[PDB]
Amino acid sequence: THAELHLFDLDEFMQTYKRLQTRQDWLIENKCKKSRLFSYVAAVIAFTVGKSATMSDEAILAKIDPYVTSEVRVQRGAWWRSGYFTKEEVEMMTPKGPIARYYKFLLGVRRFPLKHGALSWACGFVPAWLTFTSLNHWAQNRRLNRYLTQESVFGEMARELVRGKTADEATTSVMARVEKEILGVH
């Protein structure tokens, strides 16, 4: 819960002096981006799997049964008329995705149903929230660890910040080196 506080100033430094960015720093940032993007999908999966542990069979049939997945487009009377839709016709209208198949398997799985509301939703949001936050936190930690072992300007700035120094002092200390070694001061 401590790397983001340094990464703020490090990111400001990088945005200002982006000209001094190498290819490996770019790859580090791209890897953090990849982890951030996969964290969304992981959060969605965790939300589904958590909320499904507290959903009754009705809450699942709301998502499988085409009687419920057709409420926007189709009259309810088309389903009350027996023979209006045939068995194959009802079958093609069912969702085929992996969530629908997971729920279809989950019908015959024992779980702990709750009434449809805020607790059934929180039992998915909490695992999803923790997954998202923790994955992004560990991604930022990995980013800082990768920067510290990087022999570059940004690595030096990150190191100087991890010692416990102030942003302005570290910027000055690193720019004193940039002017001499990189730019070739007069």
Partner 1 sequence: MGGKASEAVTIAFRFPHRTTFLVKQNVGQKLNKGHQTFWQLVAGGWLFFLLINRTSFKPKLAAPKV
Partner 2 sequence: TAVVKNLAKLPAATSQILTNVSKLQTFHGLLEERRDKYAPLAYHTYDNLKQKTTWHPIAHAWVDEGLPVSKKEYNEYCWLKKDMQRLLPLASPFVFGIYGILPLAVWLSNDGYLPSAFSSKKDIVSKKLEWYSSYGDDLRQQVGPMLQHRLKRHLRGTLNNEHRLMLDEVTESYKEIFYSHYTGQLRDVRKCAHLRLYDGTSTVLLLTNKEPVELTSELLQKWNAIKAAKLSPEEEKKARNEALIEAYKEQELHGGPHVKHMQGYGIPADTPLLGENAKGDQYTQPPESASIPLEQLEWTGDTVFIPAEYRTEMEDWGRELTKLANQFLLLPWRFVSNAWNQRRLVSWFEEILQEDALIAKEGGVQALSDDELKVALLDRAVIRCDEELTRGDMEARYKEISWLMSLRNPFIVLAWQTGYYRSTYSPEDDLPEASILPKLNRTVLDVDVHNELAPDHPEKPLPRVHPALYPNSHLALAKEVAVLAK
Partner 3 sequence: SSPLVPVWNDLRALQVFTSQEYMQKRGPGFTNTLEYKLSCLNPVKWYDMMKVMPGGKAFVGTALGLALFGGWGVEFVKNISVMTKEKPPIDWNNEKLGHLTRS
Ligand X SMILES: CCCCCCCCCCCCCCCCCC(=O)OC[C@H](COP(=O)([O-])OCC(O)COP(=O)([O-])OC[C@@H](COC(=O)CCCCCCCCCCCCCCCCC)OC(=O)CCCCCCCCCCCCCCCCC)OC(=O)CCCCCCCCCCCCCCCCC
Q: Which amino acid is at 14?
A: M
Return the DSSP state at 182: I
Smallest distance, Å, CB 186 to partner 1? 27
Within its chain, how far is the Cα of 167 from the centroid?
30
Angle at 153 between CA 147 and CA 157, to 5 degrees: 65
Tokens coding 48: 């589904």
Binding residue for partner 3 (CB under 8 A) from 13, 124, 156, 170?
Answer: 156
Report the 10 Å Cβ neighbour count for 112. 9
Nearer Cβ to ligand X, position 36 or 159? Answer: 36
Nearer Cβ to partner 2, position 78 or 176? Answer: 78
* Residue written as token pair 């990088």: 14
Binding residue for partner 1 (CB under 8 A) from 27, 37, 92, 109?
Answer: 109
Site for partner 3 in 84-113 (CB under 8 A): 86, 88, 91-92, 95-97
Instruction: Give CA–CA dist 111/149, Å, rounded.
Output: 47
Are 85 and 78 spatial neighbours (Cβ–Cβ below 8 Å)? yes
Smallest distance, Å, CB 148 to partner 1? 4
Size, binding site for partner 2 by CB under 8 A:
25
Binding residue for partner 2 (CB under 8 A) from 116, 137, 142, 159?
Answer: 116
Which of these segments, 12-20, 23-31, 64-72, 171-179, binds partner 1 (CB under 8 A)?
64-72
Does 124 interact with partner 1 (rule: CB under 8 A)? no
Instruction: Give CA–CA dist 159/154, Å, rounded.
Output: 8
Does 126 interact with ligand X (rule: CB under 6 A)? yes
83: region left, alpha or beta (phi > 0 left; psi from -120 to 50 alpha): left
Size, binding site for partner 1 by CB under 8 A:
34
Q: Report how far apart the first and last C-alpha atoms of the chain are (Å, whole number).
A: 43
Rule CB under 6 A: which residues touch ligand X?
A: 37-38, 40-41, 43-44, 47-48, 54, 63, 95-100, 112, 114-119, 121-123, 125-126, 128-130, 132
Rule CB under 8 A: which residues touch partner 2?
A: 57-59, 61-62, 65, 67-68, 71-72, 75-78, 80-84, 86, 113, 115-118
